Design a protein around this ligand. Structure first.
Ligand SMILES: *[C@@H]1O[C@H](CO)[C@@H](O[C@@H]2O[C@H](CO)[C@@H](O[C@@H]3O[C@H](CO[C@H]4O[C@H](CO)[C@@H](O)[C@H](O)[C@@H]4O)[C@@H](O)[C@H](O[C@H]4O[C@H](CO)[C@@H](O)[C@H](O)[C@@H]4O)[C@@H]3O)[C@H](O)[C@H]2NC(C)=O)[C@H](O)[C@H]1NC(C)=O
Ligand SMILES: *[C@@H]1O[C@H](CO)[C@@H](O[C@@H]2O[C@H](CO)[C@@H](O[C@@H]3O[C@H](CO[C@H]4O[C@H](CO)[C@@H](O)[C@H](O)[C@@H]4O)[C@@H](O)[C@H](O[C@H]4O[C@H](CO)[C@@H](O)[C@H](O)[C@@H]4O)[C@@H]3O)[C@H](O)[C@H]2NC(C)=O)[C@H](O)[C@H]1NC(C)=O
Ligand SMILES: *[C@@H]1O[C@H](CO)[C@@H](O[C@@H]2O[C@H](CO)[C@@H](O[C@@H]3O[C@H](CO)[C@@H](O)[C@H](O[C@H]4O[C@H](CO)[C@@H](O)[C@H](O)[C@@H]4O)[C@@H]3O)[C@H](O)[C@H]2NC(C)=O)[C@H](O)[C@H]1NC(C)=O
Ligand SMILES: *[C@@H]1O[C@H](CO)[C@@H](O[C@@H]2O[C@H](CO)[C@@H](O[C@@H]3O[C@H](CO)[C@@H](O)[C@H](O[C@H]4O[C@H](CO)[C@@H](O)[C@H](O)[C@@H]4O)[C@@H]3O)[C@H](O)[C@H]2NC(C)=O)[C@H](O)[C@H]1NC(C)=O
Ligand SMILES: *[C@@H]1O[C@H](CO)[C@@H](O[C@@H]2O[C@H](CO)[C@@H](O[C@@H]3O[C@H](CO)[C@@H](O)[C@H](O[C@H]4O[C@H](CO)[C@@H](O)[C@H](O)[C@@H]4O)[C@@H]3O)[C@H](O)[C@H]2NC(C)=O)[C@H](O)[C@H]1NC(C)=O
Ligand SMILES: *[C@@H]1O[C@H](CO)[C@@H](O[C@@H]2O[C@H](CO)[C@@H](O[C@@H]3O[C@H](CO)[C@@H](O)[C@H](O)[C@@H]3O)[C@H](O)[C@H]2NC(C)=O)[C@H](O)[C@H]1NC(C)=O
Ligand SMILES: *[C@@H]1O[C@H](CO)[C@@H](O[C@@H]2O[C@H](CO)[C@@H](O[C@@H]3O[C@H](CO)[C@@H](O)[C@H](O)[C@@H]3O)[C@H](O)[C@H]2NC(C)=O)[C@H](O)[C@H]1NC(C)=O
Ligand SMILES: *[C@@H]1O[C@H](CO)[C@@H](O[C@@H]2O[C@H](CO)[C@@H](O[C@@H]3O[C@H](CO)[C@@H](O)[C@H](O)[C@@H]3O)[C@H](O)[C@H]2NC(C)=O)[C@H](O)[C@H]1NC(C)=O
Ligand SMILES: *[C@@H]1O[C@H](CO)[C@@H](O[C@@H]2O[C@H](CO)[C@@H](O[C@@H]3O[C@H](CO)[C@@H](O)[C@H](O)[C@@H]3O)[C@H](O)[C@H]2NC(C)=O)[C@H](O)[C@H]1NC(C)=O
Ligand SMILES: *[C@@H]1O[C@H](CO)[C@@H](O[C@@H]2O[C@H](CO)[C@@H](O[C@@H]3O[C@H](CO)[C@@H](O)[C@H](O)[C@@H]3O)[C@H](O)[C@H]2NC(C)=O)[C@H](O)[C@H]1NC(C)=O
Ligand SMILES: *[C@@H]1O[C@H](CO)[C@@H](O[C@@H]2O[C@H](CO)[C@@H](O)[C@H](O)[C@H]2NC(C)=O)[C@H](O)[C@H]1NC(C)=O
Ligand SMILES: *[C@@H]1O[C@H](CO)[C@@H](O[C@@H]2O[C@H](CO)[C@@H](O)[C@H](O)[C@H]2NC(C)=O)[C@H](O)[C@H]1NC(C)=O
Ligand SMILES: *[C@@H]1O[C@H](CO)[C@@H](O[C@@H]2O[C@H](CO)[C@@H](O)[C@H](O)[C@H]2NC(C)=O)[C@H](O)[C@H]1NC(C)=O
Ligand SMILES: *[C@@H]1O[C@H](CO)[C@@H](O[C@@H]2O[C@H](CO)[C@@H](O)[C@H](O)[C@H]2NC(C)=O)[C@H](O)[C@H]1NC(C)=O
Ligand SMILES: *[C@@H]1O[C@H](CO)[C@@H](O)[C@H](O)[C@H]1NC(C)=O
Ligand SMILES: *[C@@H]1O[C@H](CO)[C@@H](O)[C@H](O)[C@H]1NC(C)=O
Ligand SMILES: *[C@@H]1O[C@H](CO)[C@@H](O)[C@H](O)[C@H]1NC(C)=O
Ligand SMILES: *[C@@H]1O[C@H](CO)[C@@H](O)[C@H](O)[C@H]1NC(C)=O
Lengths: 102, 129, 453, 132, 132, 53, 53
């Protein structure tokens, strides 16, 4: 079974900067998906097919990567962008990351 | 627009049965899959199963087999051919099932696959004690 | 010299990929059964014998069965032909009425249930004033309980009307040929091993396809075209478990199915010029309609597909099978149309096996529905008339449709299950070898010549 | 005389080969282009789409120098900035399918160049026979 | 080079101007002529009416001297009893819309004159290449 | 121009037979008022002055 | 005291479907190949006669 690994994860930063979370797969060849969950709300789709953005998505979220290694990079951090993030290849799932205000 | 509606929250005794409706409105129901997924604290997400309502063809996960059942009810009239009802049913309840459940539908683009679920319900919290 | 001049060339052989309409045409033997009794001769020019199938050298194109078009218009066209074959036939409006029913005369064990119910009711005669009392037979899957006494009604009379097919028009398939109009061509990959995606190094163009017989079946597709040598599995994304898996195997395996109960039809009149066909007396013992396949050929072909399937999932893997998981009626079992009557036949007896890393015949029982509803349209239910005599039919099982279970949590076994799903996959089992391309003349190239004044 | 020679192929038969050999046969690729109860509407719109395409091509060829020559030459010099290929290699190396992806960028301009060239040549020869 | 010059107009763009300036552009007026559940019958009869008109015009031009020249000259002298206009004024004074009402009487005869002239010229050159 | 009908209405589905729906007009929740239209005074008078002129 | 419908002595009666809406939508008209549509852009043109632009 394909297991995803999440990297750094617990990440505390200030507004106005850029940040990047990392994920690595146990099996290459497939695509990638990124999900945002805020506090006490319903999760929301950011990135499907490893580079494409959904509706209601500003383009300052940029996903990239190849093979097994994928990066999610947000430039120009805002207050609403502090949330929990998930990587997704198939029915499998990764553990998540944490964006906190520093 | 696409809209999903889940049911109200529930507390159950151990070893009980729970039936959860997921009502869909705003699109032609006979053309899209419906997936069921769960969310436990300190667990992340965990996929349960998927159902196509054109013939009700289902599939469940392997580690949850024998304990779940998915049915559907279509809309049969030439007036409102869009709305539809999915039913999930869960038996053999344990205290580890303390979680929140969600029914989802995928995105509707060209390179949209099947697993990138776009539209979500508002989630039903289930407590077993 | 170095002033090369442009030169235009008309009729350069080159093409592009495109999408357009197509052309339906069949043989001349289908016109012998006259007066449009079979469909697809309302809209069929007779095919011209020995069309050209011209061969090509070096040129190599890529194909893709999954985003291929023209299958969509095939699924449209069969539905449209089905609907065009019904409007000249009678409606069954005055039949929705209160039914007085009972059990048929049979020494019934109490725990078994009757598959036949025997009902009587009222019906209008040719005039408007007389009304008569008449009786007929029905299966249990067509009447339900309305709610001392005991009375039933039909299943469909609370959401829709009901149309009887005409007994003139037959149901057997016939070889439909597809052809391109003027200004296109159809390519064809003749490679021996081509899974279904990518480049094919030996192509050939064509003007019309081979014979295609449209049969409707949910699992275990019938009367198909088998591959050359091995047993080929094909899928779109294998690690994705949402997509089905098409298995085409080499040697066909014979299958028999039969209904043994002798039947007598009967003609009730509804009014002026309206006929209606009941099911009268039953001469013989009430047996159960069933299907036979051979044992060892089935086991050997399953060994073949295990041996071929092991390459896509590593060698040391336990592989097993299981029956259908659930859902509506016509997707758990497999279902077909033999002799002008529809069968739904249980398949749990075939998919129970497990496979380690290193004369007798199987029967399976069926059921018979009289009313049907294919394609699950919202207001369209079709009745089917009964027929005469004992019915049997022989066919070749050719292919298979499978679905992997989405097994997480570290299990080495990979079970497989049959799943019918769409009707489109049966056509995709036969149009996996044709894309349609559009001619483009008038190329332009530089060379050393110049037009004089 | 001929024991075994290359006879001819079907239309698009030569299209794998090089352009020099493919230019020997054009008439085969040209002839298979014209000809060889709701469904009648689909057949009729198919046939009129076919003749619409062929008539567009005939008109677009007519507005240049050659109406019905089927092989033309003209007075526009080849700019090597489009193709950057040698003469020696193209007629003995590449196919038209190979060619079209290489010349795909520089289209829709060459057509206008042919239009202007034919227009200016027609008005100048018009002036010539005007003083004649 | 060119700061501001007259680029080109749409089809029928020049048609208010004089004929001398309008004769510079014809290809624009020529190209916009071919291409750019009962209703399908109306669209199909519209399309076949369009191609019927265009084919009639192509044939009527073909039976004269010039098939696809788009500008012709011939061997029929202008009789001044039709037009009674000077040469100097027509190319620098009048429009085609203005012209058509003036030459409306003398039509359907000039066409037959062109027919007979082309016929006699073809049979005489036929006799010339017959003795050749 | 505004126009409105204020009476709240409840539809109701009677069945005629097999697969035939029919829509009646059921209960009326509210006071029975009268449907009407409003326009502004001075704009109407000024535009009529325009068309007289 | 009993009534009947107004139309049931001269005709049948067809119910509209509740699916199909009634609001208008911008219909564009276009000419086929080989014609053109003219348009007077003059500011004052009552409806008859010549238009200079
Ligand atoms: C996969 O493909 C196989 C091969 O074709 C199909 O098997 C055939 O199915 C057809 C059904 O269309 C069968 O055809 C039927 O045969 C009956 C018996 O015919 C014999 O007897 C007559 C009369 O004595 C002889 O002339 C003849 O030579 C045969 O020896 C016929 O009685 C049937 O016709 C009935 O219906 C028509 C309709 O109006 C009437 O006009 C007739 O009078 C008659 O009542 C029909 O012809 C055929 O027997 C099957 N087997 C073979 C070997 O061809 C499978 O059906 C197909 N798979 C599936 C799933 O359908
Ligand atoms: C597709 O085809 C398959 C293969 O045939 C079918 O699978 C079988 O389905 C039956 C369902 O009826 C399975 O269950 C069996 O049903 C029996 C019916 O119970 C009657 O008798 C009991 C008393 O014994 C009464 O109380 C009751 O009211 C009924 O009248 C059970 O009795 C069977 O039990 C057997 O096994 C147990 C355990 O060993 C013993 O204790 C019993 O004494 C008895 O021996 C049994 O449960 C049957 O098992 C299935 N077959 C196999 C091989 O497993 C599918 O049903 C069919 N698909 C569809 C949709 O029908
Ligand atoms: C497994 O499932 C996938 C779908 O989940 C299935 O589809 C293939 O996915 C790949 C993606 O890895 C597709 O490749 C793309 O094709 C399009 C076609 O135009 C290109 O535009 C893409 O370009 C990429 O790079 C660009 C550079 O800027 C980006 O802008 C662009 O967004 C893309 O990132 C890319 O080449 C592929 O077309 C599909 N389909 C097929 C038939 O391959 C895949 O087939 C399944 N199987 C396997 C073994 O993966
Ligand atoms: C489905 O039903 C069909 C019904 O027609 C059935 O097909 C028939 O099966 C029989 C027996 O399986 C076939 O009969 C064979 O005939 C050939 C040639 O005559 C013989 O070689 C065979 O045995 C003969 O020789 C034996 C000695 O070697 C003798 O002992 C024997 O009595 C014979 O004389 C064999 O019997 C028949 O040819 C087919 N017919 C057709 C049209 O297929 C089919 O078997 C059923 N399906 C399954 C899976 O059982
Ligand atoms: C037909 O019905 C429609 C119903 O929407 C109605 O249109 C609305 O009318 C009201 C009042 O005529 C408009 O409200 C206005 O709002 C603007 C901007 O907010 C204000 O400038 C106006 O007054 C404000 O300021 C006043 C002080 O100067 C305050 O005393 C006052 O309370 C406001 O704060 C004015 O109220 C509204 O914008 C429209 N809406 C639309 C969509 O047209 C319309 O008037 C009716 N027709 C007729 C002929 O009455
Ligand atoms: C259920 O099916 C049965 C047969 O399968 C039908 O029963 C038959 O009904 C007829 C009615 O005319 C009976 O005929 C009568 O039989 C007696 C016997 O002597 C004869 O004297 C009468 O003159 C008349 O011919 C027939 O007997 C009866 N069959 C049996 C076995 O009794 C029946 O119509 C069906 N419907 C029901 C029971 O509602
Ligand atoms: C078919 O048509 C026949 C004949 O019209 C129907 O028979 C009628 O059935 C009703 C109810 O079963 C009878 O009403 C009963 O009358 C008796 C005595 O008259 C009374 O004791 C009962 O309480 C009830 O009122 C009716 O008389 C009878 N008419 C005739 C001529 O027999 C029949 O019901 C229709 N339907 C079927 C399914 O058979
Ligand atoms: C069905 O046939 C197609 C075509 O042969 C197969 O697709 C091809 O699969 C191979 C893997 O065996 C792909 O190779 C991979 O290429 C990437 C490119 O970077 C490389 O990084 C990998 O390490 C690997 O070598 C290949 O790209 C792919 N596509 C084509 C056009 O060849 C397919 O695998 C076959 N089988 C099935 C079950 O679908
Ligand atoms: C696929 O295989 C499974 C396992 O063989 C089948 O499950 C079996 O389903 C039948 C009917 O759904 C169960 O029969 C039961 O009989 C009692 C008798 O009174 C009745 O009260 C029950 O309501 C039920 O009908 C049977 O117990 C069950 N077997 C097991 C081991 O749980 C399943 O039906 C198969 N699928 C198909 C389409 O055949
Ligand atoms: C609408 O516009 C048209 C076009 O401008 C007007 O029609 C024109 O009306 C004038 C009168 O104001 C006509 O002039 C008259 O001409 C005759 C010719 O002999 C002359 O004898 C009279 O004394 C008078 O001058 C003019 O002929 C007429 N038509 C055209 C083509 O200009 C029309 O009056 C305008 N207004 C309305 C309300 O229709
Ligand atoms: C017709 O068949 C049904 C089905 O067997 C019979 O229903 C039985 O009714 C008795 C008494 O009501 C019950 O004890 C049985 O358990 C029932 N069987 C089933 C399978 O539930 C019915 O009695 C039969 N009617 C006649 C007239 O024979
Ligand atoms: C099925 O039933 C019919 C109807 O009884 C049987 O046809 C009869 O066959 C016998 C034997 O030749 C004749 O004497 C009868 O006249 C036939 N009746 C009719 C109506 O044709 C038929 O044989 C039965 N099928 C079997 C027994 O396989
Ligand atoms: C089903 O399979 C049988 C053989 O298992 C096929 O029968 C062959 O058909 C071809 C073509 O008509 C003949 O040349 C052969 O002589 C037949 N027999 C054998 C043993 O190959 C049959 O065509 C298949 N299809 C159908 C519809 O019956
Ligand atoms: C018109 O009548 C309907 C029907 O009673 C009213 O809808 C109700 O609104 C109240 C307030 O939210 C709810 O509690 C009821 O459940 C609603 N009923 C239905 C059937 O939806 C509606 O509010 C009325 N319109 C008004 C008062 O303007
Ligand atoms: C029609 O009857 C069936 C019988 O069970 C029922 O399930 C269905 O809901 C009914 N439909 C309507 C519209 O009454
Ligand atoms: C299939 O046949 C082989 C060899 O005869 C045998 O070993 C195997 O057990 C058979 N399959 C099953 C499921 O029994
Ligand atoms: C499992 O496989 C074998 C052969 O089919 C047998 O023991 C049993 O009947 C099968 N199970 C079922 C439920 O039929
Ligand atoms: C139908 O009824 C109306 C009611 O007044 C009457 O005016 C009209 O004449 C009638 N028409 C016929 C044909 O009876």
């Amino acid at each position: 079974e394909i297991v995803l690994t999440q990297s750094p994860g617990i990440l505390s930063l200030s507004p106005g900067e850029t940040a990047t979370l990392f994920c690595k797969a146990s099996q290459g060849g497939n695509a990638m998906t990124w999900y945002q969950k805020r506090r006490g709300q319903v999760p929301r789709l950011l990135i499907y097919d490893t580079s494409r953005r959904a509706s209601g998505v500003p383009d300052r979220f940029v996903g990239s990567g190849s093979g097994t290694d994928f990066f999610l990079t947000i430039n120009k951090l805002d207050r609403e962008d502090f949330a929990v993030y998930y990587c997704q290849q198939f029915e499998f799932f990764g553990l998540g990351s944490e964006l906190e205000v520093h | 627009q696409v809209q999903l509606v889940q049911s109200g929250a529930v507390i159950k005794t151990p070893g009980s049965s729970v039936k959860i409706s997921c009502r869909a409105s705003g699109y032609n129901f006979r053309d899209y899959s419906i997936h069921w997924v769960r969310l436990i604290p300190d667990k992340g997400f965990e996929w349960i199963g998927w159902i196509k309502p054109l013939w009700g063809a289902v599939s469940y996960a392997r580690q949850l087999q024998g304990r779940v059942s998915m049915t559907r009810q279509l809309s049969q009239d030439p007036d409102d051919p869009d709305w539809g009802v999915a039913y999930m049913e869960f038996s053999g309840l344990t205290p580890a099932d303390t979680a929140e459940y969600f029914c989802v539908r995928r995105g509707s683009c060209d390179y949209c696959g099947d697993f990138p679920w776009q539209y979500w319900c508002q989630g039903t919290v289930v407590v077993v004690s | 010299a170095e002033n090369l001049w442009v030169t235009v060339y008309y009729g350069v052989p080159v093409w592009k990929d495109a999408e357009t309409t197509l052309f339906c045409a069949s043989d001349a033997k289908a016109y012998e059964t006259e007066k449009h009794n079979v469909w697809a001769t309302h809209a069929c020019v007779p095919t011209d014998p020995n069309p050209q199938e011209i061969h090509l050298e070096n040129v190599t194109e890529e194909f893709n069965m999954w985003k291929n078009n023209m299958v969509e218009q095939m699924h449209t066209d069969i539905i449209s032909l089905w609907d065009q074959s019904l409007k000249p036939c009678v409606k069954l409006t005055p039949l929705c009425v209160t039914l007085q029913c009972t059990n048929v005369t049979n020494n019934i064990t109490d725990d078994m249930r009757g598959e036949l119910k025997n009902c009587s009711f009222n019906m209008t005669t040719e005039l408007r004033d007389k009304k008569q009392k008449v009786y007929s037979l029905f299966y249990r899957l067509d009447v339900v309980q309305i709610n001392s006494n005991k009375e039933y009604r039909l299943i469909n009379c609370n959401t829709s009307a009901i149309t009887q097919a005409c007994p003139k028009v037959s149901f057997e398939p016939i070889p439909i040929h597809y052809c391109a109009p003027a200004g296109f061509a159809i390519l064809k990959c003749k490679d021996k091993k081509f899974n279904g995606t990518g480049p094919c190094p030996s192509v050939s163009t064509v003007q019309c396809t081979h014979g295609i017989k449209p049969v409707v079946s949910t699992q275990l597709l019938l009367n198909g075209s088998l591959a050359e040598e091995e047993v080929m599995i094909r899928s779109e994304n294998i690690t994705n478990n949402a997509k089905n898996i098409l298995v085409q195997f080499n040697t066909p395996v014979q299958i028999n199915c039969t209904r043994p109960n002798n039947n007598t039809r009967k003609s009730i009149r509804i009014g002026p010029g309206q006929a209606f066909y009941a099911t009268g007396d039953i001469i013989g013992d009430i047996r159960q309609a069933h299907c036979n396949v051979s044992k060892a050929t089935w086991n050997e072909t399953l060994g073949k597909v295990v041996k071929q399937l092991r390459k896509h999932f590593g060698n040391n893997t336990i592989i097993r099978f299981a029956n259908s998981s659930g859902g509506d009626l016509e997707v758990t079992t497999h279902s077909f149309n033999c002799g002008g009557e529809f069968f739904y036949c249980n398949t749990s007896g075939l998919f129970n096996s497990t496979w380690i890393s290193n004369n007798d015949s199987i029967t399976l029982p069926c059921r018979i529905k009289q009313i049907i509803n294919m394609w699950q349209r919202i207001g369209q239910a079709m009745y089917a008339p009964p027929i005469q005599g004992v019915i049997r039919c022989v066919s070749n099982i050719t292919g298979l449709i499978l679905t992997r279970d989405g097994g997480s949590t570290n299990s080495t076994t990979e079970t497989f299950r049959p799943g019918g799903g769409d009707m489109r996959d049966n056509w995709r089992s036969e149009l996996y070898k044709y894309k349609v391309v559009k001619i483009e003349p008038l190329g332009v190239a530089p060379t050393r010549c110049k037009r004089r004044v | 005389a001929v024991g075994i020679g290359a006879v001819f192929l079907g239309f698009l038969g030569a299209a794998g080969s090089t352009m020099g050999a493919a230019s020997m046969t054009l008439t085969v690729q040209a002839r298979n282009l014209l000809s060889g109860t709701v469904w009648g509407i689909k057949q009729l719109q198919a046939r009129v789409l076919a003749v619409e395409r062929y008539l567009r091509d005939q008109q677009l060829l007519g507005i240049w120098g050659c109406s019905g020559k089927l092989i033309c030459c003209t007075n526009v010099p080849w700019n090597s900035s489009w193709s950057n290929r040698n003469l020696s290699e193209i007629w003995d190396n590449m196919t038209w399918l190979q060619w079209d992806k290489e010349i795909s960028n520089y289209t829709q301009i060459i057509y206008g160049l042919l239009e202007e060239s034919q227009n200016q040549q027609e008005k100048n020869e018009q002036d010539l026979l005007a003083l004649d």
